Amino acid sequence: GRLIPAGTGSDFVRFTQVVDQKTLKAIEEARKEAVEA
Amino acid sequence: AEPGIDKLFGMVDSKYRLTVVVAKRAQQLLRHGFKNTVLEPEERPKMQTLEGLFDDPNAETWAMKELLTGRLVFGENLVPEDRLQKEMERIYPGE
Amino acid sequence: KGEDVPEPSVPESFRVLVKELQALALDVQTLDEKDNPVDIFEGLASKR
Lengths: 37, 95, 48
What we know:
Helix content of chain B is 37%, strand content 4%. Chain B contains four helices and one strand, in the order αααβα. Chain C is mainly alpha-helical and 48 residues long. The longest helix of chain C is centred in the middle third of the chain and has 12 residues, at 12-23. The chains are: A little secondary structure (37), B mainly alpha (95), C mainly alpha (48). Chain B: Belongs to the RNA polymerase subunit omega family.
């Protein structure tokens, strides 16, 4: 009853992620919080 | 057929990525209302019922319209695990 | 609710399957990535 090992259930595609031009600023959400003093 | 089916095929290396992209994209697109929509007021999908054009409840149909403008980006790796399960909640109200 | 459908548990097909084998005295383990039993009967069948 597991997901099939093919199609949209092929380890090749599956892990593909999607994000938007504005949440592309999640890289700069963690970008500017490091060096202190 | 469905809008720019051919062009939307070209965006990906394989058939199935676009299916994974679209669905996943739609998931967020109809998780956070339609608050995340990289698609402007005038280029949103619409119906005709009651004599009144109201936006299409069909999430799957939006994501396709969306990706067709190239405004999204997709890959095997873009962000970490539960590390995205907070970012989209704060930029677009997660209630 | 208008929420999107969630992903699903194990089907009685499989559960009941294991249990039939179980009954016939054959240990049927579902190992994880590094070969550590996984709980298909979430709680329920595990003892203590």
